[PDB]
Amino acid sequence: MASTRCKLARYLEDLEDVDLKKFKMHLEDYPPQKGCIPLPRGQTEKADHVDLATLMIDFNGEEKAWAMAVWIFAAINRRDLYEKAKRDEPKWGSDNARVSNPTVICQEDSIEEEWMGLLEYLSRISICKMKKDYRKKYRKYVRSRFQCIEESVSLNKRYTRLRLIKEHRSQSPVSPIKMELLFDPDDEHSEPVHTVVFQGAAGIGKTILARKMMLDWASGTLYQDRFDYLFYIHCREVSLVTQRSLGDLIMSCCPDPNPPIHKIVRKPSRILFLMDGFDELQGAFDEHIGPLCTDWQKAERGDILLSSLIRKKLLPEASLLITTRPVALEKLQHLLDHPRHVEILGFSEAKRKEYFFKYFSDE
Amino acid sequence: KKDYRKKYRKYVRSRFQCIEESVSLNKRYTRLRLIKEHRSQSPVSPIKMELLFDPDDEHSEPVHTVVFQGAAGIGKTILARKMMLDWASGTLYQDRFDYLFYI
Amino acid sequence: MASTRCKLARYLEDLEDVDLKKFKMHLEDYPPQKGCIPLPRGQTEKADHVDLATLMIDFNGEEKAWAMAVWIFAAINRRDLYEKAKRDEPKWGSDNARVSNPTVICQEDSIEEEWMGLLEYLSRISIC
Amino acid sequence: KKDYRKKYRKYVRSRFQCIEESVSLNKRYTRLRLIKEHRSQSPVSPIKMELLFDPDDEHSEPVHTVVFQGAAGIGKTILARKMMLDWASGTLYQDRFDYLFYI
Ligand SMILES: CC(C)(O)c1coc(S(=O)(=O)NC(=O)Nc2c3c(cc4c2CCC4)CCC3)c1
Ligand SMILES: CC(C)(O)c1coc(S(=O)(=O)NC(=O)Nc2c3c(cc4c2CCC4)CCC3)c1
Ligand SMILES: CC(C)(O)c1coc(S(=O)(=O)NC(=O)Nc2c3c(cc4c2CCC4)CCC3)c1
Ligand SMILES: Nc1ncnc2c1ncn2[C@@H]1O[C@H](COP(=O)(O)OP(=O)(O)O)[C@@H](O)[C@H]1O
Ligand SMILES: Nc1ncnc2c1ncn2[C@@H]1O[C@H](COP(=O)(O)OP(=O)(O)O)[C@@H](O)[C@H]1O
Ligand SMILES: Nc1ncnc2c1ncn2[C@@H]1O[C@H](COP(=O)(O)OP(=O)(O)O)[C@@H](O)[C@H]1O
């Protein structure tokens, strides 16, 4: 009963020659954002099976070495060894002494996929690092501000897959791109594109759509999970001469007593601002106002802050979504280039009845 | 996986015993006859418990429907309770199959 | 000037151990220039200086093996080795190899047939 | 494996001592003579403790039966208690063998 190094050596002894060569490449070339360290080519190539297991533990420690072995097994299509290592990770845990009262924890619950997953995050120091603290909080917070009055108590039940004919380039493919990859361009085309705009008549529901679009992705919900953050901002509160910074604008969404904005200032183009209603903007607004803004934290004028944000000169990679009234387009269209115009339409004949299916309680 | 398993198993297991005659069931097993209709247009293959759902070589991998024909009072109601009781502890039954639903 | 392998082996000896590790990594990761095939990781790491020079010649040929070394020396920043490789251009004759049955990439390959006898008669005049 | 081991060992160990003459047994060992009948149709191989069950080169790997012949009062009853007491602590005895059953 020694295992670990010996358990790993046993799987490695099951690799065919071709499999071993590839397993070793992967070790030597291990992808660099796991909290894992690749292994040197000399020692790796030279190592027999038991020595390779020892080398993996010496370089990365037990738990990471095991994770690396599992990933590589999948990668070289040895799914047998992938499933065997996955089922025999806390399998020596069953053959472990109770030691009477648990000094910290019994540790019996490690086979559970959620618990194994927790252990995988736990010792990551990179996946564990602060990723977890940044995620769950933001998600649940953005989620609980749109329900539970004691009519706005159910929203997804009131969905409809509202029409989304996205303006084909104004000088035939369908590509409705309603939710999945709506921001994404066609083949290449424009990878760093960030601006999308929705055109709909007054009262269509473009204000409703943003609340729904938030509510969808505010649980992951197979939405753009490859995108990290979304920022809802309706311009009812936003006004002129406010002289408030983006952080003040940001903290408006979630008033954190300890604003982590220094960590929100991370990975541009990984964060999306959902601006809502240009019509809501009340007051004068020069689309080409003289003074220019580039400072993120400076207390700047409300329209000026938007001016930089709309021009994206501040936060050059930040994505933007702007529900706009068609009549007010010429102001922003002259202001900003390459806008992903999206025409949104109301319910059809049958859909109108289907709305009453959502609404009414009796035939 | 652990939370999905142990619970379902013990639950499906404790609804068929411990009155204070239905207190022992596996003791009342018998390996009841199981001649599975050969295709209606010789191999034995009783397939009583192991791979009873499984076809022959390939044949039909995604097959899902099996039906038992027996006279009224044979014990087909009893068999399901036994077949549940068998696999409700793994018991070297189709452990390569995850869940069973008695109705 | 009979063997380029020996000259390549001497240059491998000149390489520092860190430079040799970089040289092995570069040989394994060699880019596709002049139809040159990169050495497999296991062979490069296990081979000593003499063996690696032989393996470089066996993999592509003496001329390509020397050319790969000159590029690798520049890549590993071994300027003295890179200058020496540019300074010395060995003759492409060949070193001693235990290829009694000749082998070529084509399926037909080569044999110990009449070709050998003809080559021997052509190169062997006085001894016999 | 751990739950099966320690328990069995200490248990088989504490039933042969500590009265308040049978209080020391290994001290009363002696390496008693063990001439194992050569096949009844010269090698020494006393095989007193190590590989006493083990055959010669191959010969009979799955052999299981060994029998001790001794006069009445020799100590064959004592030997089993000692042989248990030896291996009941591993004691570089047949640790490649898992369990022993005294009866
Ligand atoms: C094409 C053009 C210029 O006429 C146009 C495009 O969008 C607008 S708008 O003014 O901003 N939005 C609306 O008018 N919405 C609306 C409509 C009707 C009735 C009602 C509403 C709102 C509640 C009642 C009839 C059709 C449009 C105008
Ligand atoms: C072949 C055909 C059509 O006759 C047939 C096939 O299955 C049935 S059935 O009606 O549904 N089941 C029974 O009849 N079971 C039964 C039988 C006997 C006695 C008793 C019972 C139940 C308790 C007493 C004698 C043989 C059958 C009919
Ligand atoms: C060879 C044959 C047939 O005579 C034989 C082989 O073993 C036995 S036996 O009967 O079962 N065992 C004994 O007799 N033990 C014994 C002996 C002596 C004295 C005493 C004892 C027991 C205490 C006193 C003298 C020699 C033997 C008989
Ligand atoms: N998808 C939808 N399902 C049901 N009702 C909707 C939907 N979209 C909009 N509405 C209706 O529109 C009203 C709000 O419209 P709003 O979002 O303000 O349109 P706009 O933003 O174009 O003015 C709500 O009363 C709601 O009943
Ligand atoms: N394998 C069996 N062993 C003992 N008794 C059985 C067995 N199968 C059925 N029985 C008897 O049959 C009765 C229930 O039969 P049931 O399952 O209702 O048959 P069916 O479902 O064909 O009507 C029970 O009283 C039981 O005693
Ligand atoms: N190895 C030994 N050392 C000391 N005394 C022994 C030994 N073997 C047997 N005896 C003595 O023999 C007696 C028990 O003999 P027993 O094992 O019953 O022989 P058998 O089993 O042949 O009848 C004890 O009183 C003990 O003193």
Residue found by looking up tokens 């934290």 in the block:
A297
Experimental technique, in short, is cryo-EM
Alpha helices in A189-275 (DSSP H): 206-217, 246-253, 261-264
Counting atoms of ligand 1 from 1, which one is nearest the CA of A279? 11
Q: Which residues of A touch C47 (CB under 8 A)?
A: none
B88 annotated to a ligand binding site: no
Could you tell me which chains touch chain A, where touching means 3 or more CB pairs under 8 A? B, C, D
Which letter does DSSP use for residue A324 in this model?
A: E
For chain A, helix (H) and strand (E) counts, in that order, are: 14, 6
Separation between Cα atoms, residue A288 and residue A290, nearest integer Å: 6
Separation between Cα atoms, residue C27 and residue C21, nearest integer Å: 10
A97: distance to nearest CA of chain D, Å? 8
Q: How far apart, in Å, are the Cα atoms of A75 and each of A27, A50, A113, C76?
A: 11, 21, 20, 31
Expressed in angstroms and rounded, the spacing between residue A162 Cα and the centre of ligand 4 is 11
Q: How far apart, in Å, are the Cα atoms of C112 and each of C118, C121, C127, D67?
A: 11, 14, 21, 68
Chains B and A lie in contact, requiring 3 or more CB pairs less than 8 Å apart = yes
Residue found by looking up tokens 């909080």 in the block:
A137
Nearest to residue B93, comparing CAs of B63, B66, B54, B65? B54
Residue D35 tokens read as: 């001439």
A342 in Cβ contact with A213 (< 8 Å)? no
- Note the resolution in Å, 1 decimal: 3.9
For chain B, helix (H) and strand (E) counts, in that order, are: 2, 0
Expressed in angstroms and rounded, the spacing between residue A202 Cα and the centre of ligand 4 is 9
**Alpha-carbon radius of gyration of chain B:** 16
A22: distance to nearest CA of chain D, Å? 35
Domain enclosing residue A300, as ranges: 132-345
The amino acid that residue B10 corresponds to is: K
Taken in order B17, B22, B23, B26, is the CA torsion positive or negative?
negative
B91 annotated to a ligand binding site: no
Counting atoms of ligand 2 from 1, which one is nearest the CA of B72? 12
Expressed in angstroms and rounded, the spacing between residue A347 Cα and the centre of ligand 1 is 14
Q: How far apart, in Å, are the Cα atoms of C39 and each of A42, A152, C46?
A: 14, 67, 12
Q: Which residues of B touch A111 (CB under 8 A)?
A: 1-2
Which letter does DSSP use for residue A93 in this model?
A: T
Nearest CA to ligand 3 atom 2: D71
Distance from chain centroid for Cα B66: 11
Inter-chain touch B3–A111, beta carbons under 8 Å: no
Q: Is A93 on the interface with C (CB under 8 A)?
A: no
A319-324 vs A195-199, strand pairing mode? parallel
D88 annotated to a ligand binding site: no
Cβ neighbors of A184 (< 8 A, separation 6 or more) are A177
Burial of B96 by CB count in 10 Å (0-12 exposed, 13-18 middle, 19+ buried)?
exposed
Residue A335 tokens read as: 């202001």
User: What is the number of other CB atoms lying within 10 angstroms of the CB of residue D70?
Assistant: 12
The amino acid that residue C126 corresponds to is: S
B90 annotated to a ligand binding site: no
Nearest to residue C63, comparing CAs of C98, C97, C30, C36? C36
Separation between Cα atoms, residue A26 and residue C10, nearest integer Å: 32
- A-B CB pairs within 8 A amount to 10
A90 in Cβ contact with A67 (< 8 Å)? no
A163-166 vs A340-345, strand pairing mode? antiparallel
Q: Which residues of A touch D6 (CB under 8 A)?
A: none
C43: distance to nearest CA of chain A, Å? 9
CATH of residue A265's domain is 3.40.50.300
Separation between Cα atoms, residue D103 and residue D84, nearest integer Å: 11
